[PDB]
Amino acid sequence: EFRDDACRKEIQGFLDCAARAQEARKMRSIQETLLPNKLNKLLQRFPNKPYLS
Amino acid sequence: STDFNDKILNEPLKHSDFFNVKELFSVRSLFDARVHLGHKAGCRHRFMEPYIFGSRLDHDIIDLEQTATHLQLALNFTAHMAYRKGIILFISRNRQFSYLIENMARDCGEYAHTRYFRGGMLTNARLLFGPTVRLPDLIIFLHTLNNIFEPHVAVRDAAKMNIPTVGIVDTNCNPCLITYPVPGNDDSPLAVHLYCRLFQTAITRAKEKRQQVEALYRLQ
């Protein structure tokens, strides 16, 4: 009947898991930040030459 | 003025090797410096085939006999220009040798441009530098390719502006527009050092001989 008093354990688990989800979002963002930018820099350094020179 | 010019400028033009550049090198010295090593056969350029001796295990070997002849011609031209007091500009985008080439230019009293060649340095020179600027009388390419394996735009611009170009052309280079190509290895430090030393020595010899001839003429 939605009485949290006797659902305390499950509610605490849910809250802790949500906090862990936010923490995981933060850590994943910082970890994401080879990167496409660096790889494009490398490819620019060594470009494909489909023509003559 | 007439006799001075006749005996100073035109006198050396009557001799096959007035500055004696052939003594500055031998095929053995070029070999020891590894001037004969080119790129893989896949990187080869169609216009560099006449100068390639062969292919040793998919690695091109530059004919050092042709290199010796071409280097003789290029060094003689450079010596004559330095004697005539023309501006000699050394161009190279090989960052491994930028510092060395700049030092060689400073020591020999000539100029160097080893940095990012901004568009118009030669074709737009009057606007960029000033209407009375004096463009180089000779451009010496220690590496005719830029840093993306394309010909240095200075080659095309020098051809446009009618500035003769000496140039070390590897097996993957395009010697079509280089006035004096010197087929050789432009990637080995030994080869680059030999080229720098040769051009420095030739230019210094030419300048000192110019001073000596001027003194001889003016003292009489």
Ligand SMILES: [Mg+2]
């Ligand atoms: Mg090379």
